[PDB]
Write a protein that binds this DNA or RNA. Structure first.
Ligand SMILES: [Mg+2]
Ligand SMILES: [Mg+2]
Ligand SMILES: [Mg+2]
Ligand SMILES: [Mg+2]
Ligand SMILES: [Mg+2]
Ligand SMILES: [Mg+2]
Ligand SMILES: [Mg+2]
Ligand SMILES: [Mg+2]
Lengths: 129, 25, 217, 144, 54, 125, 111
RNA sequence: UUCGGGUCUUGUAAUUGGAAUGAGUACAAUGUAAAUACCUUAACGAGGAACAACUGGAGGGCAAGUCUGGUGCCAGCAGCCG
RNA sequence: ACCCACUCGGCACCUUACGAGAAAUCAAAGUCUUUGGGUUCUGGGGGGAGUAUGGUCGCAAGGCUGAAACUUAAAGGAAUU
RNA sequence: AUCUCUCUCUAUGCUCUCUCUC
């Protein structure tokens, strides 16, 4: 079995980026993945995503800018506290200030900076750049 | 040196030891 | 006898280009060390290590010496070279030439506070030559280049203020380590970061524009 | 795909695995089996003292040569027979048999120095005087 | 004879020279600095310190 | 017993003892500012290192956070009081730099020699 | 030629001569007949004095001069120990005979 | 024109000085349960020989000598290489 | 039954590297410093050693499990002349 | 579709080691 759909999607995206291909096909998709993509779009890491979210499960096709470098996951979604977020950023993000650690928080799925602004940490979902 | 031969030798030694133990008993 | 063979070299000689930056932009086949000397004024010729090297063929040994050269100014662009040769001085010279030919620029990055003047490194950057993996983690102001002496020297030559490094593999092979470091440095500018993002249109090459002056007929 | 388990509730297993693996680190094993106390003549101790039995000039390992000069020591605490080397040139002329002597290791975490087989310990304080001092004149030993 | 206690029993012990008192702590450091970074006549060539009678 | 009599180490010894360039630098500093002990230089570096650590920590906390507003400012004030930091230079990045030369310059050993009174650093000492 | 000609014997050169001066006795140093040539540099050699001993080869002769059974040999006895002792100098057959003639060693063993 | 002044500032050697000091000593005063020691302080107190810094090293690792005499696979060094 | 066009599933190839390799090599040994798709199981210098001691499973032979003391500065992998 | 198809004992060997200046 595929256990983490989001992870697989991210892997696919990464592979596409590596290739230089400017379109993907996320296979099972839906909800969390969609939200992640939305967040990415907000900062403009992916160009435009369109899903044949049909009568089954959903299939996302991402027309992407290619400016995205890498987009991770971590499937043991660790319960991030408001202080060790810095540590996480240091570990995961390349630059000190460029890039976004994706957090699934009670306030919703968004990047790290936005979470900080709302002062709600949650669980790590992934990261871009 | 071959390892199989060594193993065989060891086994033989073990057997001998066992025999000795039996005798003692 | 400073007569060039290549067209770029000829152009450089004539004086219709004064910028290495342009060359870097258009990725030009440099094969004359003269060009770099002409354009890049002050560059420190530094030899790292001289490894004795042999190939034991019938009648005794055959001692060749492998010199490692790191060249560069103290502001951005850094040269890197290696040569095996019979005499040591000659080998060193050859390495220097090669290093000059190589010379690669760094995207000298920041930490967040900005303030002023090109500082340390852009991102967490890596490169592997052998097993050896070199990290370059951009270290805050004054946090002196922390590395293998060789790597420290290379960084100094480049013109980096403060960097954290992390080693993997057998770093006792100094040459390999140096190569890895060079690769990592190269990677720094070959990386997409929000400071790039906004696309700037292509400028024509000096090789295409000044093509009439490069050729003598 | 990274052989070790990576789950949120997978912790216990991970810990146990780590524990099991640790048992292969030689140092850790030494620390925890109690071989520092159960085995080894310097039983946990750092600077055991004993007494001279025989004054064997032990022949060295190869590339090198020369007769090396060592001491048979009966340790006062445990009472094991020990082969312990004496530093400097002709310090044997200050040791003598039936004399009390303090010993140390070899900067070797046990084991043996790079020429002397069987030897594991430096003779350091002959009758509580120290050998270095004796060597460089400095102080004189109680003997008669 | 191949017996223990050679060399030092054989070699004549030549006594230590009198020598003018080489300074201490701060002064010594200063002297060292003067020796190494103040002048040095070997400006062209190498940054070598200890020479030889050769 | 009494208890709270705590003794602090005050200096850091370098991890590599014969890294030549570092040693040379130290020697040069000693020559410049008359120093009996390399532990003096080491002491000062340790102090500076501590300051740097604090600054780093402050930076780790975001711009115009309460901690940053307090501790950083306090540090800056302290530095100004000693001297060392310039009056234009009060922005934490400067603190992160600070060199090593400046602490060996704003000290009685050098401060006496700075206006005269001695005509040599050893004399001043 | 030394032992077996070889490709790998011309990188040595031996200099002593057959017409060399015979070495005499010293203090803590005496003459031994070899009882049995043992392994690993060790050798069982009965002294002319009247003690059994255990003889040991010490450098020098370890590769340069090969030895056999029942040979007259200079042994410097250990001054601190006694049971383990070391070979210093091998005597030639002619040399041995001369020594015997002289009467420097006790007449008990034959060459 | 062949120097040179050393004009401007230093480095250098037993040379030769002209000024400081606490470390011991200490009238005493302070200190203190009483006295030590410190903080204060009148008297005595440095010309290299004194009022004396050792401790490791100098093939590499690793800063530092293809110096001088001795020993000669011995004596011994050497954490490992050697 | 043949022939072309496709796929689906399987054993495999050949070609490259644009990756990964310490390389030899690899369409996985790739997506592994830009390091967390899920899980089991093993290894931590070589030797002593798969030995000694226990335990068990066995008619036995043996298998499963599995040390330490001591011992050395190498053993080993791939390539190169 | 053109190969053609050859053959046996032979054991062992102990004596080092080496860099420069950039
Ligand atoms: Mg010859
Ligand atoms: Mg006082
Ligand atoms: Mg000394
Ligand atoms: Mg050196
Ligand atoms: Mg010594
Ligand atoms: Mg093991
Ligand atoms: Mg059993
Ligand atoms: Mg090998």
């Amino acid at each position: 079995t595929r256990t983490s759909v989001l992870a697989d999607a991210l892997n696919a995206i990464n592979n596409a980026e590596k290739t230089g291909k400017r379109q993907v096909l996320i296979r099972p998709s839906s909800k969390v993945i969609i939200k992640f993509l939305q967040v990415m779009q907000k900062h403009g890491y992916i160009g435009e995503f369109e899903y044949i979210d049909d009568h089954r499960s959903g299939k996302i096709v991402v027309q992407l800018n290619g400016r995205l470098n890498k987009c991770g996951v971590i499937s043991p979604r660790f319960n991030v506290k408001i202080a060790d977020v810095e540590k996480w950023t240091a570990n995961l993000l390349p630059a000190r200030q460029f890039g976004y650690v994706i957090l699934t928080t009670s306030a919703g799925i968004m990047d790290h900076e936005e979470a900080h602004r709302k002062h709600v940490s949650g669980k790590i979902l992934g990261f871009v750049y | 040196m071959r390892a199989k031969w060594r193993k065989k030798r060891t086994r033989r030694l073990k057997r001998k030891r066992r025999k000795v133990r039996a005798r003692s008993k | 006898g400073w007569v060039p063979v290549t067209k770029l070299g000829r152009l450089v000689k004539a004086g219709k280009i004064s910028s290495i930056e342009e060359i870097f932009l258009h990725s030009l086949p440099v094969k004359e060390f003269q060009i770099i000397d002409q354009l890049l004024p002050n560059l420190k010729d530094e030899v790292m290590n001289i490894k004795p090297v042999q190939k034991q063929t019938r009648a005794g040994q055959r001692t060749r010496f492998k010199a490692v050269v790191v060249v560069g100014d103290s502001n951005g662009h850094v040269g890197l070279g290696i040569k095996t040769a019979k005499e040591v001085a000659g080998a060193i010279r050859a390495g220097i030439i090669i290093a000059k030919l190589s010379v690669i620029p760094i995207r000298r990055g920041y930490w967040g506070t900005n303030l002023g003047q090109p500082h340390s490194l852009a991102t967490k950057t890596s490169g592997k030559c052998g097993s050896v993996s070199v990290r370059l983690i951009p270290a805050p102001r004054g946090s002196g280049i922390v590395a293998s002496p060789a790597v420290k020297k290379l960084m100094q030559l480049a013109g980096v203020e403060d960097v954290y490094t992390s080693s993997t593999g057998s770093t006792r092979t100094l040459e390999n380590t140096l190569k890895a470091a060079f690769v990592a440095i190269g990677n720094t500018y070959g990386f997409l970061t929000p400071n790039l993002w906004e696309v700037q249109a292509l400028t024509p090459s000096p090789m295409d524009v000044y093509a009439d002056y490069a050729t003598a007929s | 795909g990274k052989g070790k388990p990576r789950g949120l509730n997978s912790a216990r297993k991970l810990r146990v695995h780590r524990r099991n693996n640790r048992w292969a680190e030689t140092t850790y094993k030494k620390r925890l089996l109690g071989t520092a106390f159960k085995s080894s003549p310097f039983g946990g101790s750092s600077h055991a003292k004993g007494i001279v039995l025989e004054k064997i000039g032990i022949e060295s390992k190869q590339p090198n040569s020369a007769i090396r000069k060592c001491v048979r020591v009966q340790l006062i605490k445990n009472g094991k027979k020990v082969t312990a080397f004496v530093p400097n040139d002709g310090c044997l002329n200050f040791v003598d048999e039936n004399d009390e002597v303090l010993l140390a290791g070899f900067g070797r975490k046990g084991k043996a120095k790079g020429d002397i087989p069987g030897v594991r310990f430096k003779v350091v304080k002959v009758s509580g005087v120290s050998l270095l001092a004796l060597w460089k004149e400095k102080k004189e030993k109680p003997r008669s | 004879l191949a017996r223990a206690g050679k060399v030092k029993s054989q070699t004549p012990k030549v006594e230590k020279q009198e020598k003018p008192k080489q300074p201490k702590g701060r002064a010594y450091k200063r002297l060292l600095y003067t020796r190494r970074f103040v002048n040095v006549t070997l400006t062209n060539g190498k940054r070598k310190m200890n020479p030889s009678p050769s | 017993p009494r208890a709270p009599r705590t003794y602090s180490k005050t200096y850091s010894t370098p991890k590599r003892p014969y890294e030549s360039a570092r040693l040379d630098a130290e020697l040069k500093l000693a020559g410049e500012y008359g120093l009996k002990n390399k532990r003096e230089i080491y002491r000062i570096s340790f102090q500076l290192s501590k300051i740097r650590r604090a600054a780093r920590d402050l930076l780790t906390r975001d711009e115009k956070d309460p901690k940053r507003l307090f501790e950083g400012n306090a540090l800056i004030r302290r530095l100004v009081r000693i001297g060392v930091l310039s009056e234009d230079k009060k922005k934490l990045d400067y603190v992160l730099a600070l060199k090593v030369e400046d602490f060996l310059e704003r000290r009685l050993q050098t401060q006496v020699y700075k206006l005269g009174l001695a005509k040599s650093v050893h004399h001043a000492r | 030629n030394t032992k077996g000609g070889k490709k790998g014997r011309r990188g040595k050169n031996d200099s002593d001569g057959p017409k060399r001066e015979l070495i005499y006795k010293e203090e803590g140093q005496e003459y031994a007949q070899i009882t049995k040539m043992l392994g690993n540099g060790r050798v069982e050699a009965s002294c002319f004095d009247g003690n059994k001993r255990m003889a040991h080869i010490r450098g020098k002769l370890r590769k340069k001069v090969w030895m056999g059974q029942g040979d007259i040999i200079l042994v410097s006895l250990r001054d601190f120990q006694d049971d383990q002792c070391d070979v210093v100098h091998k005597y030639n057959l002619d040399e041995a005979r001369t020594l015997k003639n002289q009467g420097e060693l006790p007449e008990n063993a034959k060459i």
